[PDB]
Amino acid sequence: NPMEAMDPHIFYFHFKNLRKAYGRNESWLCFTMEVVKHVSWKRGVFRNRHAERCFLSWFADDILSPNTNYEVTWYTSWSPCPECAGEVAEFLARHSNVNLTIKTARLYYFDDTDYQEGLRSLSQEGASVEIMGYKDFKYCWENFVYNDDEPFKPWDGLDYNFLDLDSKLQEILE
Ligand SMILES: [Zn+2]
């Protein structure tokens, strides 16, 4: 049961890539899906069973069909946990017709090895693991938030937090 959009206050409270936002237990997942049978399109928001597993259950039980290809993009407030990463990498291993890109606002909560191995496993199976930049936050603000046509005001330190998280992710996936 995915909702169409979230409240702007919720979006700013959960998608901040700052330090305080690491105390946020909730996890949110925006998604865009291109269904190519040769073509339909979907998009929506899941929240936390974590949000990744929710998307897998809904998508597998309600959308999936052979002779159909899927281009899926996730915008997650948290990087997937090792269990979710194993389940998603397993799912992709068994569904070659599904191509997944994961863009995350925050990495792991602490410097755990099994989180790094989860991300690396996701990448070995063909999933694109990336950090959310300003363009990604703006896109989410336009397409998954009741923005009331107000423009996206980024928070302080967004870009430097991106550069740090992207250097870290480069060190994880190399
Ligand atoms: Zn998880």
From Swiss-Prot:
Changing residue 50 to R: Nearly abolished antiviral activity. Zn(2+) 2 binds at residues 50, 81, 84. There is a cross-link at residues 42, 135, 153, 156, 159 ((Microbial infection) Glycyl lysine isopeptide (Lys-Gly) (interchain with G-Cter in ubiquitin)). Changing residue 125 to K/A: Resistant to HIV-1 Vif and reduces Vif binding. (Microbial infection) Following infection by HIV-1, ubiquitinated by a cullin-5-RING E3 ubiquitin-protein ligase complex (ECS complex) hijacked by the HIV-1 Vif protein, leading to its degradation. Residues 1-122 form the CMP/dCMP-type deaminase domain. Changing residue 125 to R: Abolished interaction with HIV-1 Vif protein. Signal peptide: none annotated. It is found in: Cytoplasm; Cytoplasm, P-body. Changing residue 84 to S: Reduced but not abolished antiviral activity. Nearly abolished antiviral activity. Disulfide bonds join 81-84. Changing residue 148 to R: Does not affect interaction with HIV-1 Vif protein. Changing residue 66 to A: Impaired interaction with HIV-1 Vif protein. The active site is at residue 52. Widely expressed. Highly expressed in ovary. It comes from the Eukaryota. Changing residue 94 to D: Abolished interaction with HIV-1 Vif protein. Changing residue 52 to A: Decrease in cytidine deaminase and antiviral activity. Belongs to the cytidine and deoxycytidylate deaminase family. The CMP/dCMP deaminase domain 1 mediates RNA binding, RNA-dependent oligomerization and virion incorporation whereas the CMP/dCMP deaminase domain 2 confers deoxycytidine deaminase activity and substrate sequence specificity. It is one of seven related genes or pseudogenes found in a cluster, thought to result from gene duplication, on chromosome 22. DNA deaminase (cytidine deaminase) which acts as an inhibitor of retrovirus replication and retrotransposon mobility via deaminase-dependent and -independent mechanisms. Exhibits antiviral activity against viruse such as HIV-1 or HIV-2. After the penetration of retroviral nucleocapsids into target cells of infection and the initiation of reverse transcription, it can induce the conversion of cytosine to uracil in the minus-sense single-strand viral DNA, leading to G-to-A hypermutations in the subsequent plus-strand viral DNA. Homodimer. Interacts with APOBEC3G in an RNA-dependent manner. Interacts with AGO1, AGO2 and AGO3. (Microbial infection) Interacts with HIV-1 Vif, leading to its ubiquitination and degradation by the proteasome. In the absence of Vif protein, specifically packaged into HIV-1 virions. This is DNA dC->dU-editing enzyme APOBEC-3F.
